[PDB]
Design a binder for this molecule. Sequence first.
Ligand SMILES: Nc1ncnc2c1ncn2[C@@H]1O[C@H](COP(=O)(O)OP(=O)(O)O)[C@@H](O)[C@H]1O
Ligand SMILES: Nc1ncnc2c1ncn2[C@@H]1O[C@H](COP(=O)(O)OP(=O)(O)O)[C@@H](O)[C@H]1O
Ligand SMILES: [Mg+2]
Ligand SMILES: [Mg+2]
Lengths: 272, 272
Amino acid sequence: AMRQCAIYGKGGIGKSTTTQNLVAALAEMGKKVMIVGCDPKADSTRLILHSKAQNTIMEMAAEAGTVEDLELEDVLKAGYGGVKCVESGGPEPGVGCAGRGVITAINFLEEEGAYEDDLDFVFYDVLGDVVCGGFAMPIRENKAQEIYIVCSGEMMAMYAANNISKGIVKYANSGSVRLGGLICNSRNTDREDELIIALANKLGTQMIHFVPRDNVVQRAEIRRMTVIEYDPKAKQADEYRALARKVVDNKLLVIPNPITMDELEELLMEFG
Amino acid sequence: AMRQCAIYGKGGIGKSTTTQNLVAALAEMGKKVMIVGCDPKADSTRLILHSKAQNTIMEMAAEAGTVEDLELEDVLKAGYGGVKCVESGGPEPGVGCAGRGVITAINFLEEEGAYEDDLDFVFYDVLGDVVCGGFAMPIRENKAQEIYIVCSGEMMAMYAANNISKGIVKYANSGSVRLGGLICNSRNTDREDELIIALANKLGTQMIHFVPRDNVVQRAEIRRMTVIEYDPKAKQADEYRALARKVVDNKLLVIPNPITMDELEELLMEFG
Ligand SMILES: Nc1ncnc2c1ncn2[C@@H]1O[C@H](COP(=O)(O)OP(=O)(O)O)[C@@H](O)[C@H]1O
Ligand SMILES: Nc1ncnc2c1ncn2[C@@H]1O[C@H](COP(=O)(O)OP(=O)(O)O)[C@@H](O)[C@H]1O
Ligand SMILES: [Mg+2]
Ligand SMILES: [Mg+2]
Protein backbone atom coordinates (compact mmCIF):
# COMPACT_ATOMS: atom_id res chain seq x y z
CA ALA A 1 0.00 0.00 0.00
CA MET A 2 0.97 3.65 -0.35
CA ARG A 3 -0.79 6.79 0.78
CA GLN A 4 -1.49 9.25 -2.01
CA CYS A 5 -1.63 12.74 -0.60
CA ALA A 6 -2.12 16.12 -2.27
CA ILE A 7 -1.28 19.54 -0.91
CA TYR A 8 -3.60 22.28 -2.23
CA GLY A 9 -3.92 25.98 -1.41
CA LYS A 10 -3.73 29.45 -2.88
CA GLY A 11 -0.60 30.72 -4.57
CA GLY A 12 2.19 31.77 -2.23
CA ILE A 13 0.52 30.32 0.86
CA GLY A 14 3.38 27.88 1.54
CA LYS A 15 2.51 24.66 -0.33
CA SER A 16 5.99 23.85 -1.62
CA THR A 17 7.82 24.90 1.55
CA THR A 18 5.42 22.90 3.72
CA THR A 19 5.40 19.86 1.42
CA GLN A 20 9.14 19.58 1.04
CA ASN A 21 9.79 20.04 4.76
CA LEU A 22 7.00 17.58 5.67
CA VAL A 23 8.46 15.04 3.23
CA ALA A 24 12.03 15.58 4.50
CA ALA A 25 10.74 14.79 8.00
CA LEU A 26 9.04 11.63 6.69
CA ALA A 27 12.28 10.57 5.00
CA GLU A 28 14.18 11.31 8.23
CA MET A 29 11.67 8.96 9.91
CA GLY A 30 12.50 6.18 7.43
CA LYS A 31 9.64 6.62 4.94
CA LYS A 32 10.05 6.30 1.17
CA VAL A 33 8.40 9.29 -0.53
CA MET A 34 7.92 10.70 -4.03
CA ILE A 35 6.99 14.35 -4.67
CA VAL A 36 5.10 15.19 -7.87
CA GLY A 37 5.08 18.90 -8.69
CA CYS A 38 1.71 19.96 -10.13
CA ASP A 39 2.28 23.75 -10.11
CA PRO A 40 3.50 25.57 -13.27
CA LYS A 41 5.97 27.49 -11.09
CA ALA A 42 7.83 24.13 -11.09
CA ASP A 43 10.04 24.77 -8.06
CA SER A 44 8.27 22.23 -5.80
CA THR A 45 11.31 19.91 -5.58
CA ARG A 46 14.26 22.34 -5.45
CA LEU A 47 14.77 22.05 -1.68
CA ILE A 48 15.00 18.26 -1.86
CA LEU A 49 17.35 18.39 -4.89
CA HIS A 50 19.46 21.38 -3.69
CA SER A 51 18.71 22.84 -7.10
CA LYS A 52 17.51 25.92 -8.92
CA ALA A 53 14.41 23.92 -9.85
CA GLN A 54 13.90 20.77 -11.91
CA ASN A 55 13.42 20.30 -15.64
CA THR A 56 9.83 19.28 -16.29
CA ILE A 57 8.24 16.30 -18.00
CA MET A 58 6.73 18.68 -20.57
CA GLU A 59 10.18 20.16 -21.27
CA MET A 60 11.94 16.80 -21.38
CA ALA A 61 9.31 15.17 -23.61
CA ALA A 62 9.67 18.04 -26.09
CA GLU A 63 13.46 17.63 -26.28
CA ALA A 64 13.25 13.82 -26.51
CA GLY A 65 10.51 13.87 -29.17
CA THR A 66 7.61 12.21 -27.37
CA VAL A 67 6.82 11.31 -23.79
CA GLU A 68 7.35 7.69 -24.91
CA ASP A 69 11.03 8.44 -25.56
CA LEU A 70 11.43 9.41 -21.90
CA GLU A 71 12.51 6.81 -19.39
CA LEU A 72 11.40 7.08 -15.79
CA GLU A 73 15.02 6.95 -14.63
CA ASP A 74 15.74 10.04 -16.75
CA VAL A 75 12.82 11.98 -15.24
CA LEU A 76 12.75 11.08 -11.53
CA LYS A 77 15.59 12.53 -9.45
CA ALA A 78 16.48 11.62 -5.88
CA GLY A 79 17.65 14.14 -3.28
CA TYR A 80 17.65 14.52 0.49
CA GLY A 81 16.81 11.28 2.28
CA GLY A 82 16.32 9.46 -1.01
CA VAL A 83 13.12 11.40 -1.75
CA LYS A 84 12.18 11.03 -5.41
CA CYS A 85 11.18 14.18 -7.29
CA VAL A 86 9.44 15.01 -10.56
CA GLU A 87 7.94 18.20 -12.04
CA SER A 88 4.97 18.22 -14.42
CA GLY A 89 5.50 21.57 -16.06
CA GLY A 90 2.93 23.31 -18.16
CA PRO A 91 2.50 25.56 -21.19
CA GLU A 92 3.83 29.10 -21.26
CA PRO A 93 1.44 31.85 -20.09
CA GLY A 94 -1.21 32.67 -22.65
CA VAL A 95 -0.78 29.31 -24.41
CA GLY A 96 -3.22 26.43 -23.92
CA CYS A 97 -4.38 25.25 -20.49
CA ALA A 98 -2.04 25.91 -17.57
CA GLY A 99 -2.78 22.51 -16.02
CA ARG A 100 -2.27 20.36 -19.14
CA GLY A 101 1.17 19.18 -18.00
CA VAL A 102 -0.27 17.61 -14.83
CA ILE A 103 -2.31 15.15 -16.88
CA THR A 104 0.68 14.22 -19.03
CA ALA A 105 2.91 13.76 -15.98
CA ILE A 106 0.63 11.63 -13.82
CA ASN A 107 -0.22 9.35 -16.74
CA PHE A 108 3.48 8.96 -17.57
CA LEU A 109 4.35 8.08 -13.98
CA GLU A 110 1.53 5.53 -13.81
CA GLU A 111 2.42 3.77 -17.06
CA GLU A 112 6.16 3.76 -16.38
CA GLY A 113 5.69 2.04 -13.01
CA ALA A 114 6.74 4.91 -10.75
CA TYR A 115 4.20 3.78 -8.14
CA GLU A 116 6.37 0.90 -6.93
CA ASP A 117 5.10 -1.02 -3.90
CA ASP A 118 8.04 0.15 -1.77
CA LEU A 119 6.84 3.78 -1.73
CA ASP A 120 5.08 4.76 1.49
CA PHE A 121 3.79 8.20 0.44
CA VAL A 122 3.26 10.20 -2.73
CA PHE A 123 2.69 13.94 -2.36
CA TYR A 124 1.27 16.04 -5.19
CA ASP A 125 1.95 19.79 -4.84
CA VAL A 126 -1.01 21.33 -6.70
CA LEU A 127 -1.92 24.89 -7.69
CA GLY A 128 -5.29 25.65 -6.06
CA ASP A 129 -6.34 29.13 -7.22
CA VAL A 130 -8.55 27.51 -9.85
CA VAL A 131 -9.92 23.97 -9.64
CA CYS A 132 -10.11 22.92 -13.28
CA GLY A 133 -8.11 21.25 -15.99
CA GLY A 134 -5.09 19.30 -14.81
CA PHE A 135 -5.33 20.97 -11.39
CA ALA A 136 -8.68 19.24 -10.82
CA MET A 137 -7.48 15.93 -12.27
CA PRO A 138 -5.97 14.57 -8.98
CA ILE A 139 -9.46 14.98 -7.50
CA ARG A 140 -11.56 14.10 -10.56
CA GLU A 141 -9.50 11.02 -11.44
CA ASN A 142 -8.96 9.76 -7.88
CA LYS A 143 -5.18 10.26 -7.79
CA ALA A 144 -4.93 11.98 -4.40
CA GLN A 145 -7.08 10.22 -1.81
CA GLU A 146 -5.97 12.53 1.05
CA ILE A 147 -6.18 16.29 0.44
CA TYR A 148 -4.44 18.64 2.88
CA ILE A 149 -5.07 22.36 2.33
CA VAL A 150 -2.48 24.90 3.40
CA CYS A 151 -4.11 28.15 4.46
CA SER A 152 -3.87 31.06 6.89
CA GLY A 153 -6.11 33.63 8.54
CA GLU A 154 -6.04 35.53 5.22
CA MET A 155 -9.57 35.68 3.81
CA MET A 156 -8.27 34.71 0.35
CA ALA A 157 -6.53 31.64 1.75
CA MET A 158 -9.69 30.58 3.59
CA TYR A 159 -11.77 31.23 0.46
CA ALA A 160 -9.41 28.99 -1.49
CA ALA A 161 -9.78 26.25 1.13
CA ASN A 162 -13.56 26.45 0.78
CA ASN A 163 -13.26 26.44 -3.02
CA ILE A 164 -11.07 23.31 -3.07
CA SER A 165 -13.53 21.67 -0.66
CA LYS A 166 -16.37 22.27 -3.15
CA GLY A 167 -14.33 20.42 -5.77
CA ILE A 168 -13.92 17.46 -3.43
CA VAL A 169 -17.67 17.37 -2.81
CA LYS A 170 -18.33 17.49 -6.54
CA TYR A 171 -16.55 14.16 -7.13
CA ALA A 172 -17.73 12.40 -3.95
CA ASN A 173 -19.81 9.82 -5.87
CA SER A 174 -16.72 8.29 -7.52
CA GLY A 175 -13.32 7.26 -6.22
CA SER A 176 -12.24 8.06 -2.69
CA VAL A 177 -10.80 11.58 -2.66
CA ARG A 178 -11.36 13.12 0.77
CA LEU A 179 -10.32 16.15 2.79
CA GLY A 180 -7.71 15.11 5.37
CA GLY A 181 -7.15 18.41 7.14
CA LEU A 182 -6.19 22.06 7.09
CA ILE A 183 -2.59 23.17 7.70
CA CYS A 184 -2.31 26.69 9.08
CA ASN A 185 0.81 28.42 7.76
CA SER A 186 0.93 31.35 10.16
CA ARG A 187 1.07 35.01 9.23
CA ASN A 188 2.00 35.75 12.88
CA THR A 189 -1.46 37.02 13.82
CA ASP A 190 -3.18 36.41 17.14
CA ARG A 191 -5.99 33.85 17.44
CA GLU A 192 -4.98 32.61 13.98
CA ASP A 193 -4.80 29.02 15.21
CA GLU A 194 -8.27 29.40 16.76
CA LEU A 195 -9.61 30.79 13.47
CA ILE A 196 -8.35 27.90 11.36
CA ILE A 197 -9.55 25.35 13.93
CA ALA A 198 -12.98 26.98 13.70
CA LEU A 199 -12.91 26.86 9.89
CA ALA A 200 -11.88 23.20 9.94
CA ASN A 201 -14.73 22.34 12.31
CA LYS A 202 -17.25 24.07 10.03
CA LEU A 203 -15.91 22.10 7.06
CA GLY A 204 -16.04 18.89 9.11
CA THR A 205 -12.28 18.30 9.18
CA GLN A 206 -9.47 19.30 11.58
CA MET A 207 -6.48 21.62 11.73
CA ILE A 208 -3.73 19.03 11.55
CA HIS A 209 -0.92 21.44 12.50
CA PHE A 210 -0.20 25.14 13.05
CA VAL A 211 3.10 25.94 11.29
CA PRO A 212 4.73 29.07 12.78
CA ARG A 213 6.27 31.80 10.69
CA ASP A 214 10.02 31.44 11.19
CA ASN A 215 12.89 33.23 9.41
CA VAL A 216 14.93 30.01 9.46
CA VAL A 217 12.80 28.95 6.49
CA GLN A 218 14.28 31.75 4.36
CA ARG A 219 17.81 31.02 5.56
CA ALA A 220 17.39 27.36 4.57
CA GLU A 221 15.81 28.15 1.19
CA ILE A 222 18.54 30.64 0.25
CA ARG A 223 20.79 27.57 0.48
CA ARG A 224 18.29 25.37 -1.44
CA MET A 225 17.46 23.15 1.56
CA THR A 226 14.60 22.18 3.79
CA VAL A 227 14.85 23.34 7.39
CA ILE A 228 15.04 19.62 8.27
CA GLU A 229 18.35 19.34 6.40
CA TYR A 230 19.63 22.89 6.97
CA ASP A 231 19.27 22.96 10.77
CA PRO A 232 17.91 19.71 12.24
CA LYS A 233 17.98 21.28 15.74
CA ALA A 234 15.78 24.25 14.80
CA LYS A 235 12.47 24.71 16.58
CA GLN A 236 10.88 24.92 13.12
CA ALA A 237 12.38 21.53 12.22
CA ASP A 238 10.50 20.07 15.17
CA GLU A 239 7.33 21.79 13.92
CA TYR A 240 7.60 20.01 10.56
CA ARG A 241 8.34 16.75 12.41
CA ALA A 242 5.14 17.26 14.39
CA LEU A 243 3.16 17.89 11.19
CA ALA A 244 4.63 14.76 9.61
CA ARG A 245 3.77 12.61 12.64
CA LYS A 246 0.17 13.81 12.60
CA VAL A 247 -0.22 13.20 8.86
CA VAL A 248 1.11 9.66 9.33
CA ASP A 249 -1.31 9.06 12.21
CA ASN A 250 -4.31 10.85 10.68
CA LYS A 251 -7.44 8.74 10.30
CA LEU A 252 -10.04 11.47 9.61
CA LEU A 253 -10.78 11.70 5.86
CA VAL A 254 -14.13 13.31 5.09
CA ILE A 255 -16.39 14.63 2.39
CA PRO A 256 -16.26 18.27 3.54
CA ASN A 257 -19.13 20.68 4.15
CA PRO A 258 -18.35 23.93 2.26
CA ILE A 259 -19.57 27.10 3.94
CA THR A 260 -21.20 30.28 2.64
CA MET A 261 -19.41 33.60 2.35
CA ASP A 262 -21.55 34.84 5.25
CA GLU A 263 -20.08 32.19 7.57
CA LEU A 264 -16.59 32.95 6.23
CA GLU A 265 -17.02 36.65 7.01
CA GLU A 266 -18.52 35.88 10.42
CA LEU A 267 -15.42 33.80 11.21
CA LEU A 268 -13.07 36.67 10.36
CA MET A 269 -15.24 39.16 12.24
CA GLU A 270 -15.39 36.88 15.29
CA PHE A 271 -11.67 36.25 15.72
CA GLY A 272 -10.82 39.95 15.27
CA ALA B 1 -12.88 57.02 -27.35
CA MET B 2 -12.63 55.02 -24.14
CA ARG B 3 -9.63 53.54 -22.39
CA GLN B 4 -9.88 49.81 -21.80
CA CYS B 5 -7.83 48.87 -18.77
CA ALA B 6 -7.31 45.55 -17.01
CA ILE B 7 -6.06 44.93 -13.50
CA TYR B 8 -4.16 41.64 -13.14
CA GLY B 9 -2.26 40.08 -10.25
CA LYS B 10 -2.09 37.08 -7.97
CA GLY B 11 -5.01 36.09 -5.78
CA GLY B 12 -5.47 38.19 -2.66
CA ILE B 13 -2.93 40.82 -3.71
CA GLY B 14 -5.51 43.64 -3.74
CA LYS B 15 -6.95 43.73 -7.27
CA SER B 16 -10.58 44.34 -6.34
CA THR B 17 -9.84 46.75 -3.50
CA THR B 18 -7.44 48.75 -5.68
CA THR B 19 -9.72 48.70 -8.74
CA GLN B 20 -12.86 49.79 -6.96
CA ASN B 21 -11.10 52.57 -5.05
CA LEU B 22 -9.27 53.73 -8.21
CA VAL B 23 -12.58 53.78 -10.09
CA ALA B 24 -14.40 55.60 -7.26
CA ALA B 25 -11.70 58.28 -7.47
CA LEU B 26 -12.18 58.52 -11.26
CA ALA B 27 -15.93 58.88 -10.77
CA GLU B 28 -15.31 61.54 -8.11
CA MET B 29 -13.23 63.32 -10.77
CA GLY B 30 -16.16 63.26 -13.21
CA LYS B 31 -15.25 60.20 -15.29
CA LYS B 32 -17.79 57.64 -16.50
CA VAL B 33 -16.53 54.13 -15.71
CA MET B 34 -17.68 50.51 -16.03
CA ILE B 35 -16.14 47.68 -13.98
CA VAL B 36 -16.25 44.16 -15.43
CA GLY B 37 -15.49 41.45 -12.89
CA CYS B 38 -13.40 38.65 -14.44
CA ASP B 39 -12.59 36.73 -11.23
CA PRO B 40 -14.71 33.70 -10.17
CA LYS B 41 -14.73 35.09 -6.61
CA ALA B 42 -17.23 37.57 -8.12
CA ASP B 43 -16.98 40.24 -5.41
CA SER B 44 -15.20 42.81 -7.63
CA THR B 45 -18.13 45.27 -7.60
CA ARG B 46 -19.50 44.97 -4.05
CA LEU B 47 -17.86 48.16 -2.77
CA ILE B 48 -19.37 50.22 -5.59
CA LEU B 49 -22.82 48.62 -5.13
CA HIS B 50 -22.77 48.53 -1.28
CA SER B 51 -23.65 44.87 -1.69
CA LYS B 52 -22.77 41.37 -0.60
CA ALA B 53 -21.59 40.78 -4.17
CA GLN B 54 -23.39 40.81 -7.52
CA ASN B 55 -25.28 38.08 -9.34
CA THR B 56 -23.26 36.99 -12.34
CA ILE B 57 -23.99 36.85 -16.06
CA MET B 58 -23.52 33.07 -15.92
CA GLU B 59 -26.05 32.82 -13.08
CA MET B 60 -28.54 35.20 -14.67
CA ALA B 61 -28.33 33.56 -18.11
CA ALA B 62 -29.07 30.18 -16.52
CA GLU B 63 -32.19 31.50 -14.76
CA ALA B 64 -33.40 33.40 -17.85
CA GLY B 65 -32.81 30.45 -20.21
CA THR B 66 -30.13 31.81 -22.53
CA VAL B 67 -27.80 34.78 -22.51
CA GLU B 68 -30.02 36.14 -25.33
CA ASP B 69 -32.93 36.42 -22.89
CA LEU B 70 -30.85 38.79 -20.75
CA GLU B 71 -31.10 42.51 -21.31
CA LEU B 72 -28.13 44.74 -20.59
CA GLU B 73 -30.27 46.87 -18.27
CA ASP B 74 -31.01 43.76 -16.19
CA VAL B 75 -27.31 42.86 -15.88
CA LEU B 76 -25.46 46.17 -15.42
CA LYS B 77 -25.96 47.86 -12.05
CA ALA B 78 -24.92 51.38 -11.09
CA GLY B 79 -23.52 52.32 -7.68
CA TYR B 80 -21.27 54.98 -6.18
CA GLY B 81 -20.68 57.89 -8.55
CA GLY B 82 -22.75 56.25 -11.27
CA VAL B 83 -20.11 53.56 -11.83
CA LYS B 84 -21.58 50.66 -13.82
CA CYS B 85 -20.86 47.15 -12.58
CA VAL B 86 -21.12 43.62 -13.98
CA GLU B 87 -19.78 40.22 -12.88
CA SER B 88 -18.86 37.43 -15.30
CA GLY B 89 -19.10 34.47 -12.98
CA GLY B 90 -17.77 31.06 -13.78
CA PRO B 91 -18.42 27.36 -13.28
CA GLU B 92 -18.32 25.75 -9.86
CA PRO B 93 -14.96 24.31 -8.74
CA GLY B 94 -14.13 21.04 -10.43
CA VAL B 95 -16.54 21.73 -13.31
CA GLY B 96 -15.34 22.93 -16.72
CA CYS B 97 -12.91 25.82 -17.18
CA ALA B 98 -12.82 28.43 -14.42
CA GLY B 99 -12.49 31.28 -16.93
CA ARG B 100 -15.33 30.28 -19.27
CA GLY B 101 -17.69 32.94 -17.86
CA VAL B 102 -15.32 35.75 -18.85
CA ILE B 103 -15.73 34.92 -22.53
CA THR B 104 -19.51 34.77 -22.24
CA ALA B 105 -19.63 38.08 -20.35
CA ILE B 106 -17.37 40.17 -22.57
CA ASN B 107 -19.12 38.96 -25.72
CA PHE B 108 -22.53 39.75 -24.20
CA LEU B 109 -21.44 43.26 -23.23
CA GLU B 110 -20.04 43.90 -26.70
CA GLU B 111 -23.12 42.71 -28.57
CA GLU B 112 -25.57 44.45 -26.26
CA GLY B 113 -23.87 47.83 -26.75
CA ALA B 114 -22.46 48.27 -23.25
CA TYR B 115 -19.43 50.07 -24.71
CA GLU B 116 -21.33 53.31 -25.28
CA ASP B 117 -19.28 56.29 -26.50
CA ASP B 118 -19.93 58.20 -23.26
CA LEU B 119 -17.82 55.81 -21.17
CA ASP B 120 -14.35 57.13 -20.39
CA PHE B 121 -12.84 53.98 -18.83
CA VAL B 122 -13.58 50.27 -18.63
CA PHE B 123 -11.72 48.26 -15.99
CA TYR B 124 -11.55 44.47 -16.09
CA ASP B 125 -10.65 42.86 -12.75
CA VAL B 126 -8.96 39.61 -13.84
CA LEU B 127 -7.67 36.56 -11.96
CA GLY B 128 -3.94 36.28 -12.77
CA ASP B 129 -2.67 33.10 -11.07
CA VAL B 130 -3.01 31.29 -14.40
CA VAL B 131 -3.00 32.99 -17.80
CA CYS B 132 -5.25 30.75 -19.87
CA GLY B 133 -8.84 30.28 -20.88
CA GLY B 134 -11.10 33.25 -20.28
CA PHE B 135 -8.45 34.84 -18.05
CA ALA B 136 -6.15 35.16 -21.08
CA MET B 137 -8.95 36.30 -23.38
CA PRO B 138 -8.68 40.06 -22.51
CA ILE B 139 -5.06 39.82 -23.70
CA ARG B 140 -5.48 37.30 -26.52
CA GLU B 141 -8.55 39.04 -27.99
CA ASN B 142 -7.36 42.62 -27.51
CA LYS B 143 -10.01 43.64 -24.96
CA ALA B 144 -7.72 45.34 -22.43
CA GLN B 145 -5.20 47.60 -24.15
CA GLU B 146 -3.69 48.84 -20.85
CA ILE B 147 -2.64 46.19 -18.31
CA TYR B 148 -1.82 47.30 -14.75
CA ILE B 149 -0.45 44.58 -12.45
CA VAL B 150 -0.97 44.81 -8.71
CA CYS B 151 1.91 43.26 -6.83
CA SER B 152 4.05 43.55 -3.70
CA GLY B 153 7.52 42.64 -2.48
CA GLU B 154 6.21 39.07 -2.06
CA MET B 155 8.14 36.76 -4.39
CA MET B 156 4.88 35.09 -5.50
CA ALA B 157 3.35 38.45 -6.40
CA MET B 158 6.45 39.42 -8.41
CA TYR B 159 6.47 36.00 -10.09
CA ALA B 160 2.85 36.54 -11.08
CA ALA B 161 3.71 39.95 -12.54
CA ASN B 162 6.45 38.35 -14.63
CA ASN B 163 4.07 35.56 -15.69
CA ILE B 164 1.37 37.98 -16.85
CA SER B 165 4.06 39.94 -18.71
CA LYS B 166 5.01 36.79 -20.66
CA GLY B 167 1.38 36.50 -21.75
CA ILE B 168 1.43 40.07 -23.02
CA VAL B 169 4.59 39.37 -25.01
CA LYS B 170 3.03 36.25 -26.49
CA TYR B 171 0.26 38.26 -28.21
CA ALA B 172 2.37 41.28 -29.19
CA ASN B 173 2.03 40.59 -32.94
CA SER B 174 -1.74 41.20 -32.89
CA GLY B 175 -3.92 43.88 -31.34
CA SER B 176 -2.49 46.46 -28.99
CA VAL B 177 -2.42 44.97 -25.49
CA ARG B 178 0.44 46.54 -23.54
CA LEU B 179 1.78 46.71 -19.99
CA GLY B 180 0.91 50.11 -18.49
CA GLY B 181 2.57 49.79 -15.10
CA LEU B 182 2.99 48.01 -11.79
CA ILE B 183 0.97 49.02 -8.72
CA CYS B 184 2.69 48.19 -5.44
CA ASN B 185 0.13 47.23 -2.78
CA SER B 186 2.35 47.44 0.27
CA ARG B 187 2.91 44.73 2.84
CA ASN B 188 4.50 47.39 5.10
CA THR B 189 8.07 46.26 4.42
CA ASP B 190 11.05 48.57 4.05
CA ARG B 191 12.52 49.33 0.60
CA GLU B 192 9.40 47.72 -0.88
CA ASP B 193 8.79 50.73 -3.11
CA GLU B 194 12.42 50.56 -4.28
CA LEU B 195 12.03 46.85 -5.03
CA ILE B 196 8.94 47.27 -7.20
CA ILE B 197 10.47 50.28 -8.99
CA ALA B 198 13.48 48.06 -9.77
CA LEU B 199 11.24 45.26 -11.03
CA ALA B 200 9.29 47.69 -13.22
CA ASN B 201 12.51 49.05 -14.73
CA LYS B 202 13.70 45.52 -15.56
CA LEU B 203 10.36 44.80 -17.25
CA GLY B 204 10.58 48.12 -19.11
CA THR B 205 7.57 49.73 -17.42
CA GLN B 206 7.12 51.91 -14.30
CA MET B 207 5.69 51.70 -10.80
CA ILE B 208 2.67 53.90 -11.28
CA HIS B 209 1.85 54.18 -7.55
CA PHE B 210 2.82 52.76 -4.16
CA VAL B 211 -0.42 52.05 -2.25
CA PRO B 212 0.20 51.95 1.53
CA ARG B 213 -1.26 49.33 3.81
CA ASP B 214 -3.94 51.13 5.81
CA ASN B 215 -6.54 49.70 8.22
CA VAL B 216 -9.10 52.22 6.94
CA VAL B 217 -9.51 49.86 3.98
CA GLN B 218 -10.93 47.15 6.26
CA ARG B 219 -13.16 49.63 8.08
CA ALA B 220 -14.59 50.79 4.75
CA GLU B 221 -15.05 47.25 3.37
CA ILE B 222 -16.84 46.03 6.51
CA ARG B 223 -19.42 48.66 5.51
CA ARG B 224 -19.31 47.63 1.81
CA MET B 225 -17.72 50.88 0.62
CA THR B 226 -14.61 52.19 -1.02
CA VAL B 227 -12.38 54.36 1.16
CA ILE B 228 -13.24 57.18 -1.28
CA GLU B 229 -16.90 57.00 -0.23
CA TYR B 230 -16.39 55.85 3.38
CA ASP B 231 -13.95 58.58 4.44
CA PRO B 232 -13.15 61.09 1.68
CA LYS B 233 -10.71 62.89 4.03
CA ALA B 234 -8.61 59.79 4.74
CA LYS B 235 -4.95 59.81 3.80
CA GLN B 236 -5.62 56.55 1.95
CA ALA B 237 -8.37 58.25 -0.06
CA ASP B 238 -5.75 60.70 -1.30
CA GLU B 239 -3.50 57.75 -2.18
CA TYR B 240 -6.17 56.29 -4.45
CA ARG B 241 -6.76 59.76 -5.92
CA ALA B 242 -3.04 59.94 -6.71
CA LEU B 243 -3.14 56.51 -8.37
CA ALA B 244 -6.17 57.54 -10.43
CA ARG B 245 -4.50 60.78 -11.58
CA LYS B 246 -1.40 58.90 -12.71
CA VAL B 247 -3.42 56.27 -14.59
CA VAL B 248 -5.31 59.05 -16.39
CA ASP B 249 -2.04 60.79 -17.28
CA ASN B 250 -0.05 57.65 -18.11
CA LYS B 251 1.42 57.52 -21.61
CA LEU B 252 3.89 54.62 -21.22
CA LEU B 253 2.42 51.40 -22.66
CA VAL B 254 5.05 48.82 -23.57
CA ILE B 255 5.66 45.28 -24.70
CA PRO B 256 7.40 44.15 -21.50
CA ASN B 257 10.70 42.34 -21.08
CA PRO B 258 10.10 39.33 -18.78
CA ILE B 259 13.01 38.43 -16.52
CA THR B 260 14.54 35.12 -15.44
CA MET B 261 14.11 33.62 -12.00
CA ASP B 262 17.77 34.44 -11.33
CA GLU B 263 17.10 38.16 -11.77
CA LEU B 264 13.94 37.85 -9.65
CA GLU B 265 15.91 36.23 -6.83
CA GLU B 266 18.73 38.77 -7.17
CA LEU B 267 16.15 41.55 -6.75
CA LEU B 268 14.81 40.05 -3.51
CA MET B 269 18.33 39.38 -2.24
CA GLU B 270 19.43 42.93 -3.09
CA PHE B 271 16.64 44.82 -1.32
CA GLY B 272 16.95 42.68 1.83
N1 LIG C 1 6.35 28.88 7.94
C1 LIG C 1 7.03 29.77 7.17
N2 LIG C 1 7.85 30.69 7.72
C2 LIG C 1 8.54 31.58 6.98
N3 LIG C 1 8.45 31.64 5.64
C3 LIG C 1 7.65 30.79 4.97
C4 LIG C 1 6.87 29.78 5.71
N4 LIG C 1 6.18 29.06 4.79
C5 LIG C 1 6.48 29.58 3.58
N5 LIG C 1 7.36 30.60 3.68
C6 LIG C 1 7.88 31.40 2.56
O1 LIG C 1 6.74 31.82 1.79
C7 LIG C 1 7.11 31.87 0.41
C8 LIG C 1 6.10 31.08 -0.43
O2 LIG C 1 6.04 29.72 0.01
P1 LIG C 1 5.82 28.55 -1.08
O3 LIG C 1 5.87 27.24 -0.33
O4 LIG C 1 6.76 28.76 -2.25
O5 LIG C 1 4.32 28.89 -1.59
P2 LIG C 1 3.41 28.12 -2.69
O6 LIG C 1 4.15 26.85 -3.04
O7 LIG C 1 2.13 27.85 -1.94
O8 LIG C 1 3.26 29.10 -3.83
C9 LIG C 1 8.49 31.25 0.30
O9 LIG C 1 9.46 32.31 0.18
C10 LIG C 1 8.71 30.57 1.61
O10 LIG C 1 10.08 30.63 1.98
N1 LIG D 1 -3.82 48.91 0.75
C1 LIG D 1 -4.48 48.05 1.56
N2 LIG D 1 -4.49 48.21 2.91
C2 LIG D 1 -5.14 47.37 3.73
N3 LIG D 1 -5.81 46.29 3.30
C3 LIG D 1 -5.86 45.99 1.98
C4 LIG D 1 -5.19 46.87 1.01
N4 LIG D 1 -5.41 46.35 -0.22
C5 LIG D 1 -6.15 45.23 -0.04
N5 LIG D 1 -6.43 45.03 1.26
C6 LIG D 1 -7.19 43.89 1.81
O1 LIG D 1 -6.63 42.71 1.24
C7 LIG D 1 -7.68 41.74 1.04
C8 LIG D 1 -7.64 41.22 -0.40
O2 LIG D 1 -7.79 42.30 -1.33
P1 LIG D 1 -8.62 42.06 -2.69
O3 LIG D 1 -8.66 43.38 -3.42
O4 LIG D 1 -9.92 41.35 -2.37
O5 LIG D 1 -7.65 40.99 -3.44
P2 LIG D 1 -7.84 40.29 -4.89
O6 LIG D 1 -9.01 40.98 -5.55
O7 LIG D 1 -6.53 40.60 -5.58
O8 LIG D 1 -8.05 38.83 -4.60
C9 LIG D 1 -8.99 42.45 1.32
O9 LIG D 1 -9.44 42.09 2.63
C10 LIG D 1 -8.63 43.91 1.34
O10 LIG D 1 -9.44 44.60 2.28
MG1 LIG E 1 4.93 26.09 -4.84
MG1 LIG F 1 -10.86 40.29 -6.27
